[PDB]
Amino acid sequence: MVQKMYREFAENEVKPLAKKVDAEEYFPKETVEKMGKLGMMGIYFPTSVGGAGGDVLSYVMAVEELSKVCGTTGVIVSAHTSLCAAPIYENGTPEQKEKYLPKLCSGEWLGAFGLTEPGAGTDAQGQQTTAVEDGDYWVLNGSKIFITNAGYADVFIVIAVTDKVLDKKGRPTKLCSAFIVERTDPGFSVGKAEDKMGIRGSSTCELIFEDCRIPKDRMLGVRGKGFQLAMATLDGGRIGIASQALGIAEGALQETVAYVKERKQFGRSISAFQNTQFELAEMKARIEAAKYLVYAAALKKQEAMNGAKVRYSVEAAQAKLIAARTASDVTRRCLQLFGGYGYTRDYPIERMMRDAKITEIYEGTSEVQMMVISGALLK
Amino acid sequence: QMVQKMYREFAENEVKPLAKKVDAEEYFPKETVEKMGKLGMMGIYFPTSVGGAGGDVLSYVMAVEELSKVCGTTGVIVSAHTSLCAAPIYENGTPEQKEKYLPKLCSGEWLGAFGLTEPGAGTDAQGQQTTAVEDGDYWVLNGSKIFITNAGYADVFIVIAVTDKVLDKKGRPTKLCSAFIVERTDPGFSVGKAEDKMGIRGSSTCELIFEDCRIPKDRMLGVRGKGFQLAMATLDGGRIGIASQALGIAEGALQETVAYVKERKQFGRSISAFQNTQFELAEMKARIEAAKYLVYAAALKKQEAMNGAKVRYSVEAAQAKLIAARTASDVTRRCLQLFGGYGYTRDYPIERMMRDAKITEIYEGTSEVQMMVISGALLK
Amino acid sequence: SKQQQMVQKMYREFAENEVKPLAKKVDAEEYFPKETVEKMGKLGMMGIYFPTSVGGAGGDVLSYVMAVEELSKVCGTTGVIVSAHTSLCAAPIYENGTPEQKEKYLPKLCSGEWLGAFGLTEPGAGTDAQGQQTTAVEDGDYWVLNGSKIFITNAGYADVFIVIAVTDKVLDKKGRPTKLCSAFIVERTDPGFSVGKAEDKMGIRGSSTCELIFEDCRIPKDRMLGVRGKGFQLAMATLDGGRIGIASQALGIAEGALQETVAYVKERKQFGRSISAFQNTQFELAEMKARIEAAKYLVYAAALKKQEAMNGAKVRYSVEAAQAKLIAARTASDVTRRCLQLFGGYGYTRDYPIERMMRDAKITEIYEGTSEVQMMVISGALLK
Amino acid sequence: MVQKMYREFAENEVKPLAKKVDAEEYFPKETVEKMGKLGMMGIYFPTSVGGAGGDVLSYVMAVEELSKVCGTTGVIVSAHTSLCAAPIYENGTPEQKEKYLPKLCSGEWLGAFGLTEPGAGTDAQGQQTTAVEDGDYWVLNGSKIFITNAGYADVFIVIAVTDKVLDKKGRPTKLCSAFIVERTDPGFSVGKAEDKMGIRGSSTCELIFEDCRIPKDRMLGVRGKGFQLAMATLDGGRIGIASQALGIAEGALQETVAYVKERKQFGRSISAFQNTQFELAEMKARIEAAKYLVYAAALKKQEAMNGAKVRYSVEAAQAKLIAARTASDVTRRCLQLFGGYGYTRDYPIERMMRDAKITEIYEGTSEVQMMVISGALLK
Ligand SMILES: Cc1cc2nc3c(=O)[nH]c(=O)nc-3n(C[C@H](O)[C@H](O)[C@H](O)COP(=O)(O)OP(=O)(O)OC[C@H]3O[C@@H](n4cnc5c(N)ncnc54)[C@H](O)[C@@H]3O)c2cc1C
Ligand SMILES: Cc1cc2nc3c(=O)[nH]c(=O)nc-3n(C[C@H](O)[C@H](O)[C@H](O)COP(=O)(O)OP(=O)(O)OC[C@H]3O[C@@H](n4cnc5c(N)ncnc54)[C@H](O)[C@@H]3O)c2cc1C
């Protein structure tokens, strides 16, 4: 009753704004605040922490419905929910939960997450942002690159190097910890918005820590287990991105069906040619196959959230790998069915193709997803 | 999930040892068909009230999938018998027809088969010319069916024949078909020689010849003139079974490949240690899971329709049949590569799984047909 | 290979020195590179395979194909600016023009002072090139053109246009009314002719693609190019040459993307090593280069068939072009997407050119005949 | 002329034996008898060693036309020519040339080549068959596996380990040497024919060396340079296999175009549907692109053998990679167009798909070809 339900909720919230968001690199604060007033920034979190008391699948559906019409809007929510609000709720203390989750789930605060560094993006373990103890404070130094929501975010999750310890075989190893960084923390700046191929309305900025001293109780999770917390967070985030890729491919298919039904070239609708029919049919099935992967991932996560001791990293990895590749594949072929008109800004299909490309890259590339799947498989 | 591990144990202990002989000798596995019947597996999702085992459609799907992991021949025998012969009788039969055929069919004493395809028109399933004529209290059948699964070993057949000669309101001449239950002991009915196929070679794929086949009046299944509608509703359920067959062939191919690359060594390391091997297996695994969810989703939409929920599952079946068949052919080809030269010989079963995977793209409606069904609903 | 390897270098140096430093500004600013076209004109690169007798540079068709390839390795916009100008405006004039029409337009087209363009596509039917409605009517000593063309490359900066208009309304063998077309040389200065709204496009954004408007466009009688009623056959013989140019543009985009990728993966590190030390990166590059090399041979072969036809050997090259256009365009889109993948997040930003190349590669599958058109050409010949 | 005419020769040889050669695992010895008398066993070899005096391209065309009808016949010629006769000519002394090349190019002697071992197939540098000096003789011991033509071959090229030396810095390494082995050499045995998925008429057997005492002069090439001789031999053979794959795909496309013109389902030919036309058109374009790669490599090796000093390993690697992947893809999509009739032995398409599978593996798998190509590219 929450799953079937919210799908219409999210379907009615629609996209008269997607063209200007993309064309003008414009962050949609109107949509974000409407979402806060609607509970869409706190969906699967319990009401005891400020959330809307929904389930993980309803969150996935919301992202997918938004991403059908604006990939940028889907990633703003997804990143804020899965990458900032989720690790607080999943590893934070009652005090940490109460101080941060009510304002994140209501929309009052926007959340971001910084792991990626210039030389340690895929090698997220070999990073160089550091954190040292100073009495009752921590002192951070370094930078984070390509951080979603960063220009408009109020709270940031930051992974920094806290200890340099030894491994079993004497090789020095770096241990990280997660830190809750507020936008007002001194010595913390947000750089300029990057110029991207797509999801342009999304604020992708650099983080700069120049002696950012934060209170001692901003440490999230177990000291030195920050890498494990980061990888656990990305597992939930990868379900979010997979649901984004799914909506882009679904939105692209939606528009293409409408277009081929009305345009006629040889005296008949373009939909009357067999090639058009087979392309749309094969694409739809591929999209359906990806939809169930995404849906299966979301509820395996729900199982883990409900106390069951199950792992969902593999399911999430499979979902993001297949959804992202399906999204790029569907958008390219759908643009083909538009002909020359699909190469212009009159229609959204060109934006959707640019937007689809990112889902294969960010929050862990497809290659990293295959490392996850094969690791479980070959073990 | 409890029935699934039963099937897995049965398929590995009782079916897998026989797959090589079944394929290499074009050997119908009469033995295991008797064993499965004793285990109630030829009637899985039919209720106990008609002689079934009282399972659900998915347990049947999981059984076909699990059998097909080790023997594509065994999987299709169960699938065709269940979805193409037993299902149409349960869906459109009279209480007399159900009580006579369903208990023996679900028990396994009688094997089932479906005749639709003819030589002149196989994809054009509405341009066929096998006929049934009124004669007193009997029907007279005449024609031929081609490529019939289980034909050489089936006791009861579902036969689609042209009965009425009508012409549509548009103006074009239209053939109306009817479905008929034909028993192997019928006069003027014979089964041809087994075809020589590329894969699923133990499956008995033969001709059906009707030369003045005289059958009773009460052998007509369903409404007169709707026989083609009966065939297309039967095929929708069958395509779910073929989808789970393709899924199982891909699943078993990957399983053997993962095993092989861990133990076989090259350049000093296991082949599993090379990044290209890991990514091929990873990508194939994700594609197989995507197909699996499609298959189970279709199986449950059909379960809804069987429980009273008036939904259609044609498109869900069409999607599952389409994706799972192309995944099977893709996976087995790439899995064979990871075997190297050893995968080209009969020592391993990868070459049989590749040959078995191709048929899933074709029979019970080609992938092109599946795209016709899907786009017809989408573009409506 | 030949001293054609000497001219191949010219296009590579020129692309790397004069064109490559401008590609980002061309794309980001939707900026027609008016400075490079003038440079290429002074270099005779807008007349490459036309003879000196008609004031070209006296090269071969293969040289022009490589010129487009080398330019499209760095800037797809610059590549298509030459390709349409050469293969879609100057080629039909040279192929079907009277000595006056040749002497008048070719000296300016091959020099660079005049830029060319081709109008076929209309809104109501672009793929269905037999159902258009731009009309041309006899009026005394002049022709009167009315209608519109859409998507025309170079339209906002071109001086002379090849326009296909419906002249003859004739009855066919089956009794249906068929429309016959004629080709006309329209100068930017003709009364009643206007280039119109440009297009904000996905890629090749520096290219000037605008609509053409004919509102009582009155042009001389001797502007007609070719025979009356056979303008459509002229347009399809023009497109056969142009599809070789776009196949080379696609080939170049795929080639330049691979060069950039191989450079990036050798210098960028992770997990202790260079990204080129991982097997997946190696097999991705190796397979793309093998596909690209196969597309090159198709493109190059279509060029030689075209040059065989020009040298008097009566041979058809429409299938060879369609094969080139189909495979090269699908290779470009595939290579650029997979190359961007190997860049990680850095490929999604404007810092590097791979995202521009991926956006540019998508057009080669579409303009001057979609890939579905190409397959129609190829299957028609095969099933005949 | 030698190109445009030998195409006519090769297109003409017609035997209706392909079906039973593959169905009965029957080596077509009469076909080899006929081809030897036509001079098809030494085509590109000069007349002063006993060849026909043809070019490398005609050999490629002979394999391509034979493989268009019977992939088994194409591989017998290719293996015998490119893997046994070629290294005799290219590395043998005039004494070795005079003794072996006339009978090989005339078809009296069938050639074979052994490099692959049970544990060193892709890792052809880590094998264990050895050869030691004994008076005026060598002694060979070990085993080779998967050796084409071995069941009916008279002369064999055997790679054996002759020296274990130290490399530049100090690791022990194994050096190999080539050896000409005759069928009548004592202690040399041929095993049973393997049961293969396809090219089943070809004699794929194991070689066993139990005190294979051969005269001292049967050493081929420079001592300790056997492995270098191996890869250079496989370079030529890879062009041959590429031709086979090209032939298989071409013959596949041929039968399919014929079949779709004649078969009617919906009141019109299956050629009349758009899906069929696009499938055939795209495959034709794919095949044509492979054909150029095969020919280009063939003429690069013709340059080689005319004295010009260029390497054709990369060209041969690209040719085999693309052709093998095009053959498999084409045969599968052509079987689809046959419908249920293509799954039976009535038509040759299913045998074609089984034959296409082999070209991706032997004489260097696609992964080995990508190792070669990326080696040159990344260097
Ligand atoms: C950047 C750009 C520059 C251009 N420059 C020029 C120029 O300089 N000159 C010029 O003349 N044109 C130009 N064009 C137009 C271009 O050639 C057309 O866009 C192209 O021919 C496709 O036609 P269309 O855009 O009208 O789409 P449509 O014709 O509407 O095609 C829509 C889709 O339907 C498919 N389709 C159509 N008919 C069939 C059929 N019978 N069977 C199956 N599928 C079918 C098409 O392949 C396509 O996928 C340009 C276009 C672009 C985008
Ligand atoms: C092993 C095996 C077992 C079988 N078992 C059974 C059984 O138990 N019962 C039964 O009834 N049948 C059975 N068949 C027959 C099978 O169902 C038919 O063969 C199949 O439905 C179509 O095959 P065909 O050759 O008749 O179709 P064809 O139409 O001859 O197919 C030729 C090709 O044309 C394509 N095509 C056809 N029409 C169109 C169109 N309008 N648009 C585009 N493409 C089109 C098809 O997709 C196919 O690629 C079996 C076949 C095999 C091989």
Ligand SMILES: Cc1cc2nc3c(=O)[nH]c(=O)nc-3n(C[C@H](O)[C@H](O)[C@H](O)COP(=O)(O)OP(=O)(O)OC[C@H]3O[C@@H](n4cnc5c(N)ncnc54)[C@H](O)[C@@H]3O)c2cc1C
């Ligand atoms: C739009 C956008 C939003 C982003 N948002 C965020 C955010 O909110 N939070 C955050 O922390 N980061 C974010 N990032 C950064 C992002 O996480 C990284 O870009 C991504 O994870 C990969 O980082 P990279 O590009 O440095 O990796 P690189 O390692 O530079 O990737 C280059 C290529 O090498 C491959 N590769 C690397 N190692 C191997 C290997 N061992 N084997 C095979 N292939 C390998 C990769 O898969 C890729 O194909 C964002 C990036 C973008 C573009």
Ligand SMILES: Cc1cc2nc3c(=O)[nH]c(=O)nc-3n(C[C@H](O)[C@H](O)[C@H](O)COP(=O)(O)OP(=O)(O)OC[C@H]3O[C@@H](n4cnc5c(N)ncnc54)[C@H](O)[C@@H]3O)c2cc1C
């Ligand atoms: C019909 C047939 C005929 C043959 N005829 C001959 C003949 O005449 N002469 C001869 O010498 N040989 C012959 N062979 C052997 C053939 O050359 C080998 O089968 C082939 O080279 C692969 O070696 P393998 O079979 O040991 O596979 P393996 O090396 O056991 O397989 C390794 C697999 O892993 C893949 N892979 C991916 N990454 C790597 C990596 N980093 N390192 C290693 N592998 C990797 C490989 O591509 C391959 O798929 C024949 C084989 C067959 C099937």
